[PDB]
Design a protein around this ligand. Sequence first.
Ligand SMILES: NCCc1c[nH]c2ccccc12
Ligand SMILES: [Ca+2]
Length: 223
Amino acid sequence: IVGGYTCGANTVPYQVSLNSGYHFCGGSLINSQWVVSAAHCYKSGIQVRLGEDNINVVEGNEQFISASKSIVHPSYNSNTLNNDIMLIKLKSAASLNSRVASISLPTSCASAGTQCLISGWGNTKSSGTSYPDVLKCLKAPILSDSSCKSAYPGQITSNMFCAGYLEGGKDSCQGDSGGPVVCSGKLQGIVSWGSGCAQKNKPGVYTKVCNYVSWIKQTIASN
Ligand SMILES: NCCc1c[nH]c2ccccc12
Ligand SMILES: [Ca+2]
């Protein structure tokens, strides 16, 4: 997260870290046994890390649980990043508490101008590289479809939205991928793609979770 703030430990209880020997992606806990992330985050050998703040230190609130299965969306296209969503099932159910908690799925899609919280352990520089150990947060508005389409001609599908600032300086970034965009207590987005981080006129692009609720529910119900 570029231009954000330190969230504070365990203040974003649904935020998970996906670890394959190192943190590679974020995710959102949506029930005791399932995580939602980006399809571009797919790999084998994932351990889900819940209750994290400093990802490099064991601070006492973590649960580390291996993934038993991953389900990439059937229509994901890695080239266009259309349908950039994936479910991860835990080998065992997390123990839910104040510091490890699920986030509700949307009942309706959020509008342009809604204020959201974006979070992650990704790069904090738009040109350099610096990775934070503690969770970073950004408050950002959803942008109009028209402005998003204008920013990225020919690339924005019905399954994506922009959030952020056209002026630059505040954005999600590398390593934030798969992480949450929560608006009014609902998961509305997943960190998906952008052109660089925090560049003028290149806001971040997010998977539109509201479009996937039926798939997520049905998938969970049968897996
Ligand atoms: N807005 C951040 C989108 C993003 C995800 N992974 C990345 C890697 C490099 C640059 C941007 C990104
Ligand atoms: Ca830790």
